[PDB]
Amino acid sequence: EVQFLRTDDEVVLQCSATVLKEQLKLCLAAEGFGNRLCFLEPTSNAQNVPPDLAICCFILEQSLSVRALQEMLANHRTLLYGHAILLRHAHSRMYLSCLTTSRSMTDKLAFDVGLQEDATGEACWWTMHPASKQRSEGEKVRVGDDLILVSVSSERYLHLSTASGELQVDASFMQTLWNMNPICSGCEEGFVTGGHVLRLFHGHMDECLTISPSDSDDQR
Amino acid sequence: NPCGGERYLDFLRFAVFVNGESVEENANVVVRLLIRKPECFGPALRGEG
Amino acid sequence: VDYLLRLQESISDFYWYYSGKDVIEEQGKRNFSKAMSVAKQVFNSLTE
Amino acid sequence: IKYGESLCFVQHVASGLWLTYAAPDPKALRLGVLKKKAMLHQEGHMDDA
Amino acid sequence: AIMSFYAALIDLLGRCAPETHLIQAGKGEALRIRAILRSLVPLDDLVGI
């Protein structure tokens, strides 16, 4: 059976870009506090330089139909193509959205993509459509499917811009193919899984592994 | 081809506006199609350059 | 099965559209009846 | 293997590369032609079957 | 020809623009359409033209 993405799962949004004839994988990331704007974290060189996945992890909070979303605004389901989804940043608990402002010099029509404090409003919601015709609207989204994300409010694709020398992420009319790679689906209670923050205690001796206090001579 | 563009824009305006009032059903569809095909806006409106 | 799935999606959207309203209008009832007759026939075909 | 039902990935035995379609050339939209040159690539795509 | 094409395009968009009564009612679709149109055409460009 092919795994299906379902709500409450944790995912990372990946895009591939060709640089110097070499494919490079990038994950959509955002800091949250102190910086709403989203950027791209490269994960191709993970073997040499580990990436910063904590800010890349997202949660599939909700997955509605378009009309159901309309009613909801007026007032573990599987993801289906053509359904609006809500994505909550794991670290900051802010929802990915399409911001009104734009910093893009290359593209006037494009808008910035960033985190938003509240889930209220059309901005937070994104609609997912099949990347290739072999996928068909209304079908379940199988893990590892290329998909296109269109902002509900702006009718703009989630787009990767290469016009500037540095790679940027923005919402525009040119479409970019994205992959949703799952980080976790459901953890059996009381079991350690990757990506958790934890303390390593020396047996039960109430001693923990740590580094020196701040301003220490050993430079921590 | 600005001339052909002008002709087709003219058919579209007649569908979008009737008797001095806009028709929402056609207007939304036309706007969505135009944005989905940016070249219709012409070279100038094109975002990249 | 594919046609039945398309019909189900349409009916769900139509229900969502009337979910807000307190009472369903007569034209909406007529359209529901059409859709339900078609769905009945499709279910009978699958049963057979 | 079965006709129609089974989906197969074609692999060059020696090199090990996977038969796949090349990314459409720029201006292919102007070409208006669906033709996509095929190529052997180590990675491939999801829909290469 | 170029000026006529752009004038016809802007006229078509203006006609696609929603009606004031719908805007006052605050319909989400109407507000979204107006936002798209405003993004497409800056105000400064209209004033300059």
Side-chain angles (χ1 to χ4, degrees), chain C residues 13-41:
Chain C
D13 291 338
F14 193 109
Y15 153 75
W16 281 117
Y17 167 90
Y18 290 163
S19 77
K21 297 179 177 67
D22 64 339
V23 67
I24 307 188
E25 191 47 286
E26 186 266 326
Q27 49 254 22
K29 293 203 264 223
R30 156 167 37 84
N31 296 332
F32 273 116
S33 182
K34 275 142 72 73
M36 287 189 198
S37 295
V38 174
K40 176 182 289 296
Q41 183 49 66

Side-chain angles (χ1 to χ4, degrees), chain B residues 2-3 5-6 9-10 12-13 16-17 20-22 24 27-28 30-32 34-35 40-45, chain E residues 1-2 4-6 8-9 11-19 21-22 27 29 32-33 36-37 40-42:
Chain B
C3 318
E6 211 286 340
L9 287 162
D10 286 7
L12 291 180
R13 43 218 228 52
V16 310
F17 216 63
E21 287 172 68
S22 170
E24 293 82 3
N28 301 352
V30 165
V31 172
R32 264 180 257 281
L34 291 201
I35 60 169
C40 308
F41 295 127
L45 275 291
Chain E
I2 295 187
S4 295
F5 173 95
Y6 281 126
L9 178 64
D11 168 83
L12 166 68
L13 297 188
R15 295 195 198 280
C16 288
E19 297 284 308
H21 75 283
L22 290 202
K27 200 157 162 212
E29 300 258 348
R32 209 203 292 137
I33 288 291
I36 297 161
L37 298 176
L40 291 167
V41 191

Side-chain angles (χ1 to χ4, degrees), chain A residues 55-108:
Chain A
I55 56 171
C56 307
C57 292
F58 277 101
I59 295 173
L60 295 163
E61 190 157 290
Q62 314 208 32
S63 179
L64 271 44
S65 176
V66 295
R67 189 71 70 197
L69 167 63
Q70 302 224 354
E71 306 317 299
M72 211 205 68
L73 300 158
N75 272 2
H76 291 345
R77 324 161 191 61
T78 302
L79 300 185
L80 303 180
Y81 283 100
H83 279 181
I85 55 172
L86 180 76
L87 284 148
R88 185 200 328 135
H89 198 236
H91 164 238
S92 76
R93 319 286 312 300
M94 311 205 208
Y95 304 89
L96 178 82
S97 79
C98 172
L99 316 171
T100 62
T101 64
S102 188
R103 294 181 311 71
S104 169
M105 315 276 269
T106 184
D107 185 353
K108 315 209 204 65

Side-chain angles (χ1 to χ4, degrees), chain A residues 27-155:
Chain A
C27 279
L28 183 57
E31 187 46 60
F33 313 95
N35 209 354
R36 305 286 184 271
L37 273 289
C38 292
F39 58 94
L40 285 185
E41 183 67 23
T43 59
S44 279
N45 211 28
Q47 303 105 313
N48 283 267
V49 179
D52 204 346
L53 274 189
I55 56 171
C56 307
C57 292
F58 277 101
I59 295 173
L60 295 163
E61 190 157 290
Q62 314 208 32
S63 179
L64 271 44
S65 176
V66 295
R67 189 71 70 197
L69 167 63
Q70 302 224 354
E71 306 317 299
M72 211 205 68
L73 300 158
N75 272 2
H76 291 345
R77 324 161 191 61
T78 302
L79 300 185
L80 303 180
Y81 283 100
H83 279 181
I85 55 172
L86 180 76
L87 284 148
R88 185 200 328 135
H89 198 236
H91 164 238
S92 76
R93 319 286 312 300
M94 311 205 208
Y95 304 89
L96 178 82
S97 79
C98 172
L99 316 171
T100 62
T101 64
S102 188
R103 294 181 311 71
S104 169
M105 315 276 269
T106 184
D107 185 353
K108 315 209 204 65
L109 296 173
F111 288 158
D112 288 335
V113 173
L115 292 176
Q116 181 196 323
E117 293 83 3
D118 291 331
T120 56
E122 287 185 354
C124 312
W125 293 84
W126 294 82
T127 305
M128 53 206 309
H129 309 101
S132 82
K133 64 163 271 203
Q134 64 104 9
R135 286 291 154 279
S136 88
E137 301 255 349
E139 289 179 352
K140 305 175 154 254
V141 180
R142 280 82 66 193
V143 171
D145 291 332
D146 288 344
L147 58 86
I148 307 167
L149 297 178
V150 191
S151 176
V152 173
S153 67
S154 65
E155 310 287 331

